[PDB]
Amino acid sequence: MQVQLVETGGGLVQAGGSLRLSCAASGNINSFNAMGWFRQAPGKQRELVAAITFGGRTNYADSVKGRFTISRDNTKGSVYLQMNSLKPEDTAVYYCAASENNLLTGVWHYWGRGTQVTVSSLE
């Protein structure tokens, strides 16, 4: 079976709150290395906001630095996105992606179907 990615954890969240997204990759862990989270806000391209090498080294989009943390557990074939200090501007469809290779910028060979995260303002 080809590797498959299913994101969990999406939903509605209040601004200032937090949310963890998770993705298990099915199949053979040896067939992928780098993993990442993309987000597509309405009207926008899918934007890579966090990526992680097989060994755990990370890179973040400037727009999420200091607020989001990407991590992984290879014993569970999983990658996680802990999103703190959420803002309305973080509302988007969040996609997990994976690569056969171990670079933080592509090529993204495998994609989940995405999960919606909606951050509502307090005012």
Numbering used by the authors: 1 to 123
Show passages lifted from the paper.
The integrin receptor αMβ2 mediates phagocytosis of complement-opsonized objects, adhesion to the extracellular matrix, and transendothelial migration of leukocytes. Integrin αMβ2, also known as complement receptor 3, CD11b/CD18, and macrophage-1 antigen (Mac-1), participates in all three types of interactions. The ectodomain is divided into a HP consisting of the N-terminal domains, and the tailpiece consisting of the membrane-proximal C-terminal domains. αMβ2 contains a von Willebrand factor type A domain, known as the αI domain, in the α-chain. Nbs are single domain antibodies of typically 120 residues derived from the variable domain of heavy chain–only antibodies present in members of the Camelidae family.
To favor the selection of Nbs with potential for interfering with the interaction between αI domain and C3d, we performed competitive elution with recombinant C3d. To support the modeling of the αMβ2–Nb complex, we also determined the structure of hCD11bNb1 itself based on diffraction data extending to a resolution of 1.14 Å. Furthermore, known structures of the αI domain and our own 1.14 Å-resolution structure of hCD11bNb1 itself considerably facilitated modeling of the intermolecular interface.
